[PDB]
Amino acid sequence: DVFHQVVKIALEKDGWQITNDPLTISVGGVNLKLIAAEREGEKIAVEVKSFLERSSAISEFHTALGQFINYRGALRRRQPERVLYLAVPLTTYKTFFQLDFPKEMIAENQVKMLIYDVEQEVIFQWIN
Amino acid sequence: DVFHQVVKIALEKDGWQITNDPLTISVGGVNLKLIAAEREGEKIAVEVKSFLERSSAISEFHTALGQFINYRGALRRRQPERVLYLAVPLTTYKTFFQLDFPKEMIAENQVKMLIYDVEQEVIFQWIN
Ligand SMILES: [Cl-]
Ligand SMILES: [Cl-]
């Protein structure tokens, strides 16, 4: 809940309007915490991860990646101009996501990223 | 543990040799339950799911899919001729995997599947 609220505030500081939280989505016989936001007509969806959810970073990464792929597929078929981002803390970005394997998997799967700083609750970088 | 043993027995009945359980794999700075098996020089790896692991089937599917993608990527770089399969029970195959959304995601991500019957502990179908 805390990291969810950190990401909303970071988005708000950059002038995004939060329109749905959660963004709910059902497609192809399945009902799938996503934040929907927009800013001057640019629409996005944000999958928030703290990377304290599990065990290891790698275990969380598996679930985060699968969710990312599935939500991205679902969103194509419902709101094709809403771009999906995986939000992760700066500490995780600078450590886990600098390892060769996760960096490669992010690239192979075209994962777009919102890097947020937890302490100050700000957006540090948009990736891809 | 039970479903893990069901899949091994199903493989053994079809003349597969189990060579590693777990198959361990480390690549690109990360250490990633996978069964390694072979039969007349054909090598495979099997990610076993019962689809009783979580909450809903969809929640498990997210983790199963992310794991599949990451293990498949790791295996390319270590044992490129060992083909990865996602093992799922026949009951799940005939219900969840006949829904349009999971069927589509399996197709989009080229997920190969081992469909096993739990009651009789046999392989029913190989997919993709
Ligand atoms: Cl941070
Ligand atoms: Cl079954």
* DSSP states of chain B: -HHHHHHHHHHHHTTPEEEESSPP-EETTEE--PEEEEETTEEEEEEE--S-SSSSHHHHHHHHHHHHHHHHHHHHTT-TTEEEEEEEEHHHHHTGGGSHHHHHHHHHTT--EEEEETTTTEEEEEE-
Alpha carbon distance B75, B19 (integer Å)? 15
Nearest-5° angle of CA A89, CA A95, CA A101?
A: 110
Question: Rounded to an integer, what is the distance from CA A116 to the centroid of its chain?
Answer: 10
Task: State which residue of chain A sits closest to B100, comparing Cα positions.
Answer: A28
Question: Facing residues of B27 across strands?
Answer: B30
> Residue B120 corresponds to which amino acid?
Q
Q: CB burial class (10 A; 0-12, 13-18, 19+) of residue B22?
A: exposed
| Cα–Cα separations (whole angstroms), residue A52 to A48, A91, A92, A108, B83 | 12, 11, 10, 24, 32
Q: CB burial class (10 A; 0-12, 13-18, 19+) of residue B42?
A: exposed
Nearest-5° angle of CA B42, CA B44, CA B49?
A: 155
Question: Rounded to an integer, what is the distance from CA B28 to the centroid of its chain?
Answer: 22
Q: What three-state secondary structure class fits A77?
A: coil
CA dihedral of residues A37, A42, A43, A49 (deg, nearest 10): -60
Alpha carbon distance A28, B108 (integer Å)? 14
Which residues in B have their CB inside 8 Å of a CB on A? 27-32, 58, 61-70, 73-74, 99-105, 108-109
In the structure encoding, which two tokens stand for residue B6, read together? Answer: 């069901």
| Cα–Cα separations (whole angstroms), residue B51 to A80, B47, B56, B90 | 30, 12, 8, 11
Residues B54/B92, Cβ–Cβ less than 8 Å: no
Contact assignment for B100 to A65 by CB distance below 8 Å: no
Nearest-5° angle of CA B91, CA B94, CA B98?
A: 140
> Residue A22 corresponds to which amino acid?
P
Side-chain-side CA neighbours of residue B107 (13 Å): 9
Chain A residues lying within 8 Å of B103, measured CB to CB: 28
Chain A residues lying within 8 Å of B66, measured CB to CB: 61-69
In our burial notation (b when 16+ CB lie closer than 10 A, e otherwise), range A21-60 reads bebebebeebebebbbbeeeeeebbbbbbbbeeeeebbbb
Residues B46/B85, Cβ–Cβ less than 8 Å: yes
Contact assignment for B100 to A58 by CB distance below 8 Å: no
| Span from the CA of B32 to the centroid of ligand 1 (angstroms) | 25
Chain B residues lying within 8 Å of A72, measured CB to CB: none
Residues A46/A8, Cβ–Cβ less than 8 Å: no
Residues A39/B48, Cβ–Cβ less than 8 Å: no
| Structural resolution in Å | 1.6
| Span from the CA of B12 to the centroid of ligand 2 (angstroms) | 17
Alpha carbon distance A118, B1 (integer Å)? 39
The method recorded for this entry reads X-ray
| Residue position matching structure tokens 């690239």 | A107
Rg of chain A on CA atoms, in Å: 14
A18 to chain B, closest Cα gap in Å: 25
Q: Please give the domain boundaries of chain A with CATH numbers for all domains.
A: 1-128 (3.40.1350.10)
Question: Rounded to an integer, what is the distance from CA B22 to the centroid of its chain?
Answer: 13
Question: Facing residues of B20 across strands?
Answer: B36
Residues A62/A51, Cβ–Cβ less than 8 Å: no
Side-chain-side CA neighbours of residue B98 (13 Å): 7
Residues B12/B23, Cβ–Cβ less than 8 Å: no
Alpha carbon distance B73, A101 (integer Å)? 9
Task: State which residue of chain A sits closest to B65, comparing Cα positions.
Answer: A66
Nearest-5° angle of CA A20, CA A37, CA A79?
A: 80
Angle at which helices A57-76 and B57-76 cross, to 10°: 110
Q: What three-state secondary structure class fits A60?
A: helix
